[PDB]
Amino acid sequence: DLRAELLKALLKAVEEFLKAAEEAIKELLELLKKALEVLKKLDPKSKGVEALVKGAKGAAKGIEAAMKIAKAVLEVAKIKVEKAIAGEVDPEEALRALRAALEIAFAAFELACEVLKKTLEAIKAVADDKYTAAILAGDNPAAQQKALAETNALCTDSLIAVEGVEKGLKGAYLALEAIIEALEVAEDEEGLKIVAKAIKEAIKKAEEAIKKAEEAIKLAKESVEKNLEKLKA
Amino acid sequence: DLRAELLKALLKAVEEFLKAAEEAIKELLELLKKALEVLKKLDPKSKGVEALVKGAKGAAKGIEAAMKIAKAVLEVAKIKVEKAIAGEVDPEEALRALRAALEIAFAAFELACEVLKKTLEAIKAVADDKYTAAILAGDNPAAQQKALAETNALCTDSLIAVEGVEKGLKGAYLALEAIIEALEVAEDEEGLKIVAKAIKEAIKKAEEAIKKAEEAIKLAKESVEKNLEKLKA
Amino acid sequence: GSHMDLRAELLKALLKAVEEFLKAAEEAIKELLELLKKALEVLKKLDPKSKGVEALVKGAKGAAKGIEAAMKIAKAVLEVAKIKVEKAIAGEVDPEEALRALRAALEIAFAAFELACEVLKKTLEAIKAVADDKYTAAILAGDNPAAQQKALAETNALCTDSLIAVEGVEKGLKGAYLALEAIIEALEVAEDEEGLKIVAKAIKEAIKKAEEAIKKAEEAIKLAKESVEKNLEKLKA
Amino acid sequence: GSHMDLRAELLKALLKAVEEFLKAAEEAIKELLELLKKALEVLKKLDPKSKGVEALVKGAKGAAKGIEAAMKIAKAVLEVAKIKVEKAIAGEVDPEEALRALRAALEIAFAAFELACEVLKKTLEAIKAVADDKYTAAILAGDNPAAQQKALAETNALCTDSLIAVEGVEKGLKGAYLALEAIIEALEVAEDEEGLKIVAKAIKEAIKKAEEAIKKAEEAIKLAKESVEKNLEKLKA
């Protein structure tokens, strides 16, 4: 009865994780397009920048495909949980199914953060190299140093925002992963009662971490979106 | 009995590791709170920083939840060790439990160091963008460069302190992780006698590393706390 | 027939996607190792009497040998993967052995690819760091600070552009590797008919999107060749 | 018959290659920990009243202890690996049990090695960052900015060359580790006679390329010792 109770609370918590993960992925990929536009306008004749754009588009395709799989695996996990509660299938198959949906989602999420991180850092590096060339050329060094300082200030604020999103979900992914690891060690009734108290508290805090992560995702949207418009201008 | 002898010292070593890991997590998360305060004060109208603050609190929740699991798994590990010493259960079940408790804690510990590192780097990056804006604005560039230089000195030494704590326990985690793998390969009596000498010396060096890590934990609180006050000041 | 046919259909398209991935991975490694050769020459010319620079050259050549050796393995495993997939379609072998074989060929190659991008990045970052230390030493010595800062700014612009190009190549295949790894993970969880009907739609779309990612990566690889090769010539001059 | 001879032949050459890796990795670890001692002293001399620096020193001493423990385990497992290989040749034990032992000894050794490279790299980066904070504070204070800016450039030049040297060591063995890891993965997939015949060609070539990487790595280890040691004494003076 305790095992069936834990599997339900874990399954519900994992469902909440995929929702937040999907919201993040949709918004991060939206920011990436606008970021890629700013980068092209900043350096339109660079084959290196063009390679990054093609590479970023390819990575974006893989992220979308990977989450579609994660949603389907969650559905297979739902059935396996019911059957594990009904005693038809070994509960370990349900844990591996829940683990699969969890790991696939976070994997796609972490790649989205990395592509956006590298893109914002690319804009910063390209801008630093463009203005510095004008400063040393005497093309109004006073105005160039100001735009350089402003641009770096805008990219830094966006990089800090994206890093907050990763740390938000990484904490939730860490808690849920520890819960699944406890269930794999607690195979008998004796073990399950030892971890039951810790696991129940972990599932609640994991959902709290998702809440703070969802809040962080919203602020990251406003932060990066506004900063990308000032850069475009 | 020789296998039971190693399993006893190994269980003790993992218990000491979990003790140091908890103190580290307790102190690192405490420094994070003050670090988040300094970051907000540096740029109070930045939504990017706000996203990180929410994200950092969310990550902190996951670290506490993940460590609660590590405590429970250690208790389950203790019973499986007793049964392995008494011959009721295969020692492999005890090793799988010890590895889980060990890996879960270090995962939460390594994440705590990462969140704090990112926060200190944010304080450094935000200050660099604030002072540079004042230097270029003519608001006493001599004095601003002095505050800028001091701030970078304060953030840099704090990053060195956190890095010492992470490397301390990572060394201990490496030794214990190698011991568990050796016991899993040496299943027969012949194999166990070959690794016994290497394992016993490893247990001593691993505990010495945990002690050296605790010392680093002590210095890190005093160092970072003082440095964070000067930045706030 | 109603369900063993859907399994055979997915395993074939998956094998095709892995085949395209393995081809792109080989092309990437071939050119990245070529750019590394040109980069090591520029690095030696930048600091020819440094034992630190020489140590990296020795280390970089050793890593290149491991990348070439690792990819020869990845192609052979693909052949073993082909046999196990066909036998799984014919019901001769459990489908997990075919999935586990595909993972080996996939993971081993991408590992060699990941190292090629990393070694090239470290070399390009070394060229930038060595040049920064050479020009700054000349600027502080009064050896025409205006011209040195111009070369310093140009050099940093050229090294940065090459690092951005390499980063685009890695992210291109990483997206494809992400999709295919998720596809295999779904097939390993969906062993029965009921689960397989749920993931079939997502898997079919994923294999197409994965093939698009491989194409977008190949384009990035070609653009990276022209950019980095040309930039390395300007640095040598 | 002939397939068991091919398997026994590959397992022997693999064991030889893995044995060379652990020895070369051990020599590197011995030298890296020796350079780490000198590096911790240079950092201490640069900032003797910083508890942050002291915390890193204590942490580095602990990490150094863990690396030695991990390497002692890796040699013992290598001995167990040799016996399991002999038993697999005689057909007494499943070859998969021997592969997990070889992989274990391989993974345990490289883990300690990669940590050693990180600790030294982090220590060298700390010396560079601490020096930047010492000279810049003096430059802004008017304490002879001409001499301070030169010392700042000289220190960064010495730290950068050492970081390039250490990076050559990491890439050297990681390339060898990549080849050996790919070989072990191929043997676990090629269980039947047909599969073993496919990987024989790739594995035999890989073992030669893997040993070539070890040779180029050993050269890098020798050059890295002289480079980093020489740079560390100039800073001490």
PDB file of N, CA, C and O in Angstrom, chain D residues 28-72:
ATOM      1  N   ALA D  28      52.135  10.185 -15.170  1.00  0.00           N
ATOM      2  CA  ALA D  28      51.562  11.526 -15.239  1.00  0.00           C
ATOM      3  C   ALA D  28      51.074  11.987 -13.870  1.00  0.00           C
ATOM      4  O   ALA D  28      51.393  13.097 -13.426  1.00  0.00           O
ATOM      5  N   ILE D  29      50.286  11.148 -13.192  1.00  0.00           N
ATOM      6  CA  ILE D  29      49.746  11.504 -11.880  1.00  0.00           C
ATOM      7  C   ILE D  29      50.872  11.810 -10.899  1.00  0.00           C
ATOM      8  O   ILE D  29      50.787  12.760 -10.111  1.00  0.00           O
ATOM      9  N   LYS D  30      51.943  11.012 -10.930  1.00  0.00           N
ATOM     10  CA  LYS D  30      53.085  11.268 -10.057  1.00  0.00           C
ATOM     11  C   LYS D  30      53.669  12.652 -10.313  1.00  0.00           C
ATOM     12  O   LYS D  30      54.045  13.361  -9.372  1.00  0.00           O
ATOM     13  N   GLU D  31      53.752  13.052 -11.582  1.00  0.00           N
ATOM     14  CA  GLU D  31      54.344  14.341 -11.920  1.00  0.00           C
ATOM     15  C   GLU D  31      53.372  15.487 -11.662  1.00  0.00           C
ATOM     16  O   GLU D  31      53.783  16.557 -11.200  1.00  0.00           O
ATOM     17  N   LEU D  32      52.084  15.286 -11.966  1.00  0.00           N
ATOM     18  CA  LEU D  32      51.095  16.334 -11.723  1.00  0.00           C
ATOM     19  C   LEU D  32      50.990  16.668 -10.241  1.00  0.00           C
ATOM     20  O   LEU D  32      50.926  17.846  -9.867  1.00  0.00           O
ATOM     21  N   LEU D  33      50.968  15.648  -9.379  1.00  0.00           N
ATOM     22  CA  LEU D  33      50.915  15.908  -7.945  1.00  0.00           C
ATOM     23  C   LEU D  33      52.195  16.570  -7.452  1.00  0.00           C
ATOM     24  O   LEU D  33      52.161  17.334  -6.480  1.00  0.00           O
ATOM     25  N   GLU D  34      53.326  16.292  -8.105  1.00  0.00           N
ATOM     26  CA  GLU D  34      54.569  16.965  -7.744  1.00  0.00           C
ATOM     27  C   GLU D  34      54.515  18.439  -8.126  1.00  0.00           C
ATOM     28  O   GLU D  34      54.900  19.312  -7.338  1.00  0.00           O
ATOM     29  N   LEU D  35      54.047  18.735  -9.343  1.00  0.00           N
ATOM     30  CA  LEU D  35      53.856  20.124  -9.749  1.00  0.00           C
ATOM     31  C   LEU D  35      52.812  20.820  -8.887  1.00  0.00           C
ATOM     32  O   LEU D  35      52.925  22.024  -8.629  1.00  0.00           O
ATOM     33  N   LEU D  36      51.785  20.086  -8.446  1.00  0.00           N
ATOM     34  CA  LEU D  36      50.759  20.676  -7.590  1.00  0.00           C
ATOM     35  C   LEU D  36      51.360  21.210  -6.296  1.00  0.00           C
ATOM     36  O   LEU D  36      50.964  22.279  -5.815  1.00  0.00           O
ATOM     37  N   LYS D  37      52.306  20.472  -5.711  1.00  0.00           N
ATOM     38  CA  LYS D  37      52.964  20.942  -4.497  1.00  0.00           C
ATOM     39  C   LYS D  37      53.640  22.287  -4.734  1.00  0.00           C
ATOM     40  O   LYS D  37      53.448  23.236  -3.965  1.00  0.00           O
ATOM     41  N   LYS D  38      54.431  22.388  -5.806  1.00  0.00           N
ATOM     42  CA  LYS D  38      55.091  23.651  -6.121  1.00  0.00           C
ATOM     43  C   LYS D  38      54.075  24.745  -6.425  1.00  0.00           C
ATOM     44  O   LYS D  38      54.264  25.903  -6.036  1.00  0.00           O
ATOM     45  N   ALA D  39      52.984  24.393  -7.112  1.00  0.00           N
ATOM     46  CA  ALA D  39      51.964  25.382  -7.449  1.00  0.00           C
ATOM     47  C   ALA D  39      51.267  25.920  -6.204  1.00  0.00           C
ATOM     48  O   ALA D  39      50.974  27.119  -6.123  1.00  0.00           O
ATOM     49  N   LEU D  40      50.975  25.051  -5.233  1.00  0.00           N
ATOM     50  CA  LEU D  40      50.352  25.521  -3.999  1.00  0.00           C
ATOM     51  C   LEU D  40      51.279  26.440  -3.214  1.00  0.00           C
ATOM     52  O   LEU D  40      50.808  27.369  -2.548  1.00  0.00           O
ATOM     53  N   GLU D  41      52.590  26.200  -3.279  1.00  0.00           N
ATOM     54  CA  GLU D  41      53.543  27.078  -2.608  1.00  0.00           C
ATOM     55  C   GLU D  41      53.584  28.453  -3.265  1.00  0.00           C
ATOM     56  O   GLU D  41      53.569  29.479  -2.575  1.00  0.00           O
ATOM     57  N   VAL D  42      53.650  28.493  -4.599  1.00  0.00           N
ATOM     58  CA  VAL D  42      53.671  29.771  -5.308  1.00  0.00           C
ATOM     59  C   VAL D  42      52.421  30.583  -4.990  1.00  0.00           C
ATOM     60  O   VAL D  42      52.490  31.801  -4.785  1.00  0.00           O
ATOM     61  N   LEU D  43      51.261  29.926  -4.945  1.00  0.00           N
ATOM     62  CA  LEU D  43      50.026  30.630  -4.615  1.00  0.00           C
ATOM     63  C   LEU D  43      50.049  31.133  -3.176  1.00  0.00           C
ATOM     64  O   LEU D  43      49.592  32.248  -2.893  1.00  0.00           O
ATOM     65  N   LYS D  44      50.558  30.315  -2.251  1.00  0.00           N
ATOM     66  CA  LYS D  44      50.661  30.729  -0.854  1.00  0.00           C
ATOM     67  C   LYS D  44      51.575  31.940  -0.706  1.00  0.00           C
ATOM     68  O   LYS D  44      51.252  32.892   0.012  1.00  0.00           O
ATOM     69  N   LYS D  45      52.733  31.914  -1.374  1.00  0.00           N
ATOM     70  CA  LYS D  45      53.642  33.056  -1.328  1.00  0.00           C
ATOM     71  C   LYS D  45      52.999  34.311  -1.903  1.00  0.00           C
ATOM     72  O   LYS D  45      53.308  35.424  -1.465  1.00  0.00           O
ATOM     73  N   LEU D  46      52.103  34.151  -2.881  1.00  0.00           N
ATOM     74  CA  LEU D  46      51.476  35.307  -3.515  1.00  0.00           C
ATOM     75  C   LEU D  46      50.454  35.967  -2.597  1.00  0.00           C
ATOM     76  O   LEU D  46      50.311  37.196  -2.603  1.00  0.00           O
ATOM     77  N   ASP D  47      49.731  35.175  -1.806  1.00  0.00           N
ATOM     78  CA  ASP D  47      48.743  35.702  -0.865  1.00  0.00           C
ATOM     79  C   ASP D  47      48.755  34.845   0.389  1.00  0.00           C
ATOM     80  O   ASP D  47      47.983  33.881   0.513  1.00  0.00           O
ATOM     81  N   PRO D  48      49.620  35.165   1.357  1.00  0.00           N
ATOM     82  CA  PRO D  48      49.749  34.311   2.544  1.00  0.00           C
ATOM     83  C   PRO D  48      48.678  34.532   3.597  1.00  0.00           C
ATOM     84  O   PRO D  48      48.510  33.666   4.467  1.00  0.00           O
ATOM     85  N   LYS D  49      47.950  35.647   3.555  1.00  0.00           N
ATOM     86  CA  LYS D  49      46.960  35.955   4.577  1.00  0.00           C
ATOM     87  C   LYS D  49      45.529  35.732   4.107  1.00  0.00           C
ATOM     88  O   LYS D  49      44.593  36.176   4.778  1.00  0.00           O
ATOM     89  N   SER D  50      45.336  35.060   2.976  1.00  0.00           N
ATOM     90  CA  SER D  50      44.004  34.793   2.449  1.00  0.00           C
ATOM     91  C   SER D  50      43.571  33.405   2.901  1.00  0.00           C
ATOM     92  O   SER D  50      44.216  32.408   2.558  1.00  0.00           O
ATOM     93  N   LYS D  51      42.478  33.341   3.665  1.00  0.00           N
ATOM     94  CA  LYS D  51      41.929  32.044   4.045  1.00  0.00           C
ATOM     95  C   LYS D  51      41.270  31.351   2.862  1.00  0.00           C
ATOM     96  O   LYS D  51      41.161  30.119   2.851  1.00  0.00           O
ATOM     97  N   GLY D  52      40.818  32.119   1.869  1.00  0.00           N
ATOM     98  CA  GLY D  52      40.331  31.503   0.646  1.00  0.00           C
ATOM     99  C   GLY D  52      41.415  30.704  -0.049  1.00  0.00           C
ATOM    100  O   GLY D  52      41.190  29.572  -0.486  1.00  0.00           O
ATOM    101  N   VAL D  53      42.611  31.288  -0.165  1.00  0.00           N
ATOM    102  CA  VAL D  53      43.748  30.559  -0.719  1.00  0.00           C
ATOM    103  C   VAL D  53      44.086  29.362   0.161  1.00  0.00           C
ATOM    104  O   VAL D  53      44.370  28.265  -0.336  1.00  0.00           O
ATOM    105  N   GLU D  54      44.058  29.553   1.483  1.00  0.00           N
ATOM    106  CA  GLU D  54      44.337  28.453   2.401  1.00  0.00           C
ATOM    107  C   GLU D  54      43.311  27.337   2.255  1.00  0.00           C
ATOM    108  O   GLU D  54      43.666  26.152   2.278  1.00  0.00           O
ATOM    109  N   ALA D  55      42.031  27.697   2.114  1.00  0.00           N
ATOM    110  CA  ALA D  55      40.993  26.692   1.901  1.00  0.00           C
ATOM    111  C   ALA D  55      41.265  25.870   0.647  1.00  0.00           C
ATOM    112  O   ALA D  55      41.072  24.648   0.643  1.00  0.00           O
ATOM    113  N   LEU D  56      41.705  26.525  -0.430  1.00  0.00           N
ATOM    114  CA  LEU D  56      42.037  25.798  -1.651  1.00  0.00           C
ATOM    115  C   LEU D  56      43.213  24.855  -1.426  1.00  0.00           C
ATOM    116  O   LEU D  56      43.220  23.728  -1.936  1.00  0.00           O
ATOM    117  N   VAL D  57      44.223  25.304  -0.675  1.00  0.00           N
ATOM    118  CA  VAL D  57      45.377  24.456  -0.384  1.00  0.00           C
ATOM    119  C   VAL D  57      44.944  23.210   0.378  1.00  0.00           C
ATOM    120  O   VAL D  57      45.321  22.085   0.031  1.00  0.00           O
ATOM    121  N   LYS D  58      44.152  23.396   1.436  1.00  0.00           N
ATOM    122  CA  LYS D  58      43.628  22.258   2.184  1.00  0.00           C
ATOM    123  C   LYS D  58      42.802  21.344   1.286  1.00  0.00           C
ATOM    124  O   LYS D  58      42.948  20.117   1.328  1.00  0.00           O
ATOM    125  N   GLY D  59      41.925  21.929   0.468  1.00  0.00           N
ATOM    126  CA  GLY D  59      41.139  21.126  -0.456  1.00  0.00           C
ATOM    127  C   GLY D  59      41.997  20.393  -1.469  1.00  0.00           C
ATOM    128  O   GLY D  59      41.709  19.249  -1.830  1.00  0.00           O
ATOM    129  N   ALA D  60      43.057  21.046  -1.950  1.00  0.00           N
ATOM    130  CA  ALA D  60      43.950  20.405  -2.908  1.00  0.00           C
ATOM    131  C   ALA D  60      44.715  19.255  -2.265  1.00  0.00           C
ATOM    132  O   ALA D  60      44.940  18.220  -2.903  1.00  0.00           O
ATOM    133  N   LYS D  61      45.128  19.419  -1.003  1.00  0.00           N
ATOM    134  CA  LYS D  61      45.800  18.329  -0.302  1.00  0.00           C
ATOM    135  C   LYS D  61      44.880  17.125  -0.157  1.00  0.00           C
ATOM    136  O   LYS D  61      45.314  15.978  -0.317  1.00  0.00           O
ATOM    137  N   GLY D  62      43.605  17.367   0.153  1.00  0.00           N
ATOM    138  CA  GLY D  62      42.647  16.275   0.221  1.00  0.00           C
ATOM    139  C   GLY D  62      42.439  15.602  -1.122  1.00  0.00           C
ATOM    140  O   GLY D  62      42.402  14.372  -1.217  1.00  0.00           O
ATOM    141  N   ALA D  63      42.288  16.406  -2.179  1.00  0.00           N
ATOM    142  CA  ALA D  63      42.139  15.851  -3.521  1.00  0.00           C
ATOM    143  C   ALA D  63      43.362  15.035  -3.922  1.00  0.00           C
ATOM    144  O   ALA D  63      43.232  13.988  -4.568  1.00  0.00           O
ATOM    145  N   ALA D  64      44.559  15.503  -3.556  1.00  0.00           N
ATOM    146  CA  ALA D  64      45.771  14.752  -3.864  1.00  0.00           C
ATOM    147  C   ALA D  64      45.762  13.390  -3.181  1.00  0.00           C
ATOM    148  O   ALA D  64      46.193  12.389  -3.766  1.00  0.00           O
ATOM    149  N   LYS D  65      45.283  13.339  -1.936  1.00  0.00           N
ATOM    150  CA  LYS D  65      45.173  12.069  -1.225  1.00  0.00           C
ATOM    151  C   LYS D  65      44.227  11.114  -1.943  1.00  0.00           C
ATOM    152  O   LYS D  65      44.527   9.923  -2.093  1.00  0.00           O
ATOM    153  N   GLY D  66      43.074  11.620  -2.390  1.00  0.00           N
ATOM    154  CA  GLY D  66      42.115  10.782  -3.092  1.00  0.00           C
ATOM    155  C   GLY D  66      42.624  10.244  -4.415  1.00  0.00           C
ATOM    156  O   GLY D  66      42.246   9.145  -4.827  1.00  0.00           O
ATOM    157  N   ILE D  67      43.474  11.008  -5.104  1.00  0.00           N
ATOM    158  CA  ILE D  67      44.021  10.543  -6.376  1.00  0.00           C
ATOM    159  C   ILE D  67      44.941   9.347  -6.158  1.00  0.00           C
ATOM    160  O   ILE D  67      44.904   8.372  -6.920  1.00  0.00           O
ATOM    161  N   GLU D  68      45.781   9.399  -5.120  1.00  0.00           N
ATOM    162  CA  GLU D  68      46.662   8.273  -4.819  1.00  0.00           C
ATOM    163  C   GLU D  68      45.867   7.024  -4.462  1.00  0.00           C
ATOM    164  O   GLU D  68      46.198   5.921  -4.914  1.00  0.00           O
ATOM    165  N   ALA D  69      44.828   7.172  -3.636  1.00  0.00           N
ATOM    166  CA  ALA D  69      43.993   6.025  -3.296  1.00  0.00           C
ATOM    167  C   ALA D  69      43.360   5.415  -4.541  1.00  0.00           C
ATOM    168  O   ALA D  69      43.316   4.188  -4.686  1.00  0.00           O
ATOM    169  N   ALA D  70      42.866   6.257  -5.452  1.00  0.00           N
ATOM    170  CA  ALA D  70      42.211   5.750  -6.653  1.00  0.00           C
ATOM    171  C   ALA D  70      43.190   5.028  -7.570  1.00  0.00           C
ATOM    172  O   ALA D  70      42.809   4.069  -8.250  1.00  0.00           O
ATOM    173  N   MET D  71      44.449   5.466  -7.603  1.00  0.00           N
ATOM    174  CA  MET D  71      45.420   4.843  -8.495  1.00  0.00           C
ATOM    175  C   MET D  71      45.919   3.512  -7.939  1.00  0.00           C
ATOM    176  O   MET D  71      46.171   2.574  -8.705  1.00  0.00           O
ATOM    177  N   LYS D  72      46.080   3.419  -6.615  1.00  0.00           N
ATOM    178  CA  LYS D  72      46.405   2.140  -5.989  1.00  0.00           C
ATOM    179  C   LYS D  72      45.330   1.094  -6.261  1.00  0.00           C
ATOM    180  O   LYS D  72      45.641  -0.074  -6.524  1.00  0.00           O
TER     181      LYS D  72
END
